[PDB]
Amino acid sequence: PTNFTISVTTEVMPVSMTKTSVDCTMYICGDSVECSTLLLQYGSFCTQ
Amino acid sequence: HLKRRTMMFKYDENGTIVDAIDCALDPLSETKCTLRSFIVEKGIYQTS
Numbered sequence: 001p002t003n004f005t006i007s008v009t010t011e012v013m014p015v016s017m018t019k020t021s022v023d024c025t026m027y028i029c030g031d032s033v034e035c036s037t038l039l040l041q042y043g044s045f046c047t048q
Numbered sequence: 049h050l051k052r053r054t055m056m057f058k059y060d061e062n063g064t065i066v067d068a069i070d071c072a073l074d075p076l077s078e079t080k081c082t083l084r085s086f087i088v089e090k091g092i093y094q095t096s
């Protein structure tokens with residue numbers, strides 16, 4: 001080669017995604033007290 | 049007067065209840081309740 005080109009190119013890399021948390025008692029039940037109980041048997045899964 | 053609440057009971061080695069806490073009294077008791085423990089390490093904790 002007798003010449004050259006100075007090339008600037010982009011590389012797009014994702015680094016982080018959106019952090020999220022879930023209230024099970026709010027998702028599984030709207031505000032039902034009757035659903036808040038009988039959800040106590042599934043509390044270990046929601047802590048997981 | 050009693051109210052409908054969730055509470056965490058600690059049983060000792062002999063089977064007697066010692067040092068209960070009342071969940072949904074303050075958020076510290078709530079994260080004690082969701083951790084199934086009475087010792088809470090330093091950090092940020094999501095509650096309901």
Ligand SMILES: *[C@@H]1O[C@H](CO)[C@@H](O)[C@H](O)[C@H]1NC(C)=O
Nearest residue numbers: 001002003004005006007008
């Ligand atoms: C190299 O390329 C540049 C850009 O086209 C030009 O200005 C320059 O004269 C070239 N050099 C040679 C030695 O051909």
Ligand SMILES: *[C@@H]1O[C@H](CO)[C@@H](O)[C@H](O)[C@H]1NC(C)=O
Nearest residue numbers: 059060061062063064065066
């Ligand atoms: C359990 O009972 C034994 C025998 O009375 C006693 O020595 C021991 O301290 C008790 N353990 C407790 C209170 O954690």
